[PDB]
Design a protein around this ligand. Structure first.
Ligand code: NA
Length: 129
């Protein structure tokens, strides 16, 4: 599913990401924009042989099982395919663990490079939230 911007903002808010670990909703929407273009089905292979999955590009080396990432962990205890669903519940629950892991939103490289320090409130402009 390709979310609209405000549609994703409302779902992320409903699932408890606004101000989660102190990150405002606009940071999460910006991260999803640049990680996945708001596409739940986005996948991207990494050089280490892991893959990133879903709207927040969650990595199979640590967080989910895809059966092809040797020596990897599954700390969200989910198949990586669960992160491609139209229902973002699994992605949000797993993102909450990732952002709690010690480096905050720096775990999302597109957030660090394209959102961090910018006017992230712009990403929820116009939304009825
Ligand atoms: Na894994």
């Amino acid at each position: 599913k390709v979310f609209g911007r405000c549609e994703l903002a409302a779902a992320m808010k409903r699932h408890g990401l606004d101000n989660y670990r102190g990150y405002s909703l606009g940071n999460w929407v910006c991260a999803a924009k640049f990680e996945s273009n708001f596409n739940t089905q986005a996948t991207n292979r990494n050089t280490d042989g892991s893959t990133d999955y879903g709207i927040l590009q969650i990595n199979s080396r640590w967080w989910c099982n895809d059966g092809r990432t040797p020596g990897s962990r599954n700390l969200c205890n989910i198949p990586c395919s669960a992160l491609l669903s139209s229902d973002i519940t699994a992605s949000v629950n797993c993102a909450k663990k990732i952002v709690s892991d010690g480096n905050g939103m720096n775990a999302w490289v597109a957030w660090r490079n394209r959102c961090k320090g910018t006017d992230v409130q712009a990403w929820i402009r116009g939304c009825r939230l």
